[PDB]
Amino acid sequence: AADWDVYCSQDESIPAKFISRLVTSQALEKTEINCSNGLVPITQEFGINMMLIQYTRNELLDSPGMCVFWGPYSVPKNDTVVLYTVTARLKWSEGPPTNLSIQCYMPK
């Protein structure tokens, strides 16, 4: 009932773009993004929704809703990328919540 993507950047100075589309009849009660600097709530409206996700905590300013990736993490397969990630929890009016993983690999 929800679709989403993340569009990752090639440099830590440019934030990633999270884009979701909500198609629903059970309503969506809450959406919470679990970021390295805290839990950020959003309200996914009918159709398209958008959010910026910063790669570094050095991009935080005194402003609402900023979200920093957890990471960077090394991955086991190779040493030419690192992983940045957040998760999202979607609480529906009925049934169990939906848990989403939002991942960006950054070349090194």
Partner: protein
């Protein structure tokens, strides 16, 4: 929850601030955009406020609490203008144009664009 006068004062300033930034960006990058693509970006501004209203309220409530006095509508005007300014929406405009991802302009977007900012629905 929030008194209607305070909600309107917020929304008018947030949308005003986002729209100012888009006009500036369009002066440089709008030449090759279609009319509906420009309208899509105006909708992006209104929808961004809707999507983030929950975390706006968290930040606003902390600022209002810090007043140490009963708030007035001017306090919310001020905070709404700060929210409208303290973000570079060009990260979206640039990304959407550069990657040919400006959303298809659909009627639910036109409906929001035709509203007065004071009337744009938000959820708490």
């Amino acid at each position: 929850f929030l008194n209607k006068a305070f909600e309107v004062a917020l929304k008018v300033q947030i949308i005003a601030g986002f729209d100012r930034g888009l006009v500036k960006w369009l002066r440089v990058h709008g030449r090759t955009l279609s009319t509906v693509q420009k309208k899509a970006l105006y909708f992006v501004n209104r929808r961004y406020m809707q999507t983030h209203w929950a975390n706006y309220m968290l930040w606003i409530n902390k600022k209002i609490d810090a007043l140490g006095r009963t708030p007035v509508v001017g306090d919310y005007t001020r905070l709404g203008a700060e929210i409208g300014r303290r973000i570079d929406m060009a990260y979206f405009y640039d990304f959407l144009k550069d990657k040919n991802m400006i959303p298809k302009y659909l009627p639910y977007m036109e409906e929001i664009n035709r509203m007065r900012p004071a009337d744009v629905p938000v959820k708490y």
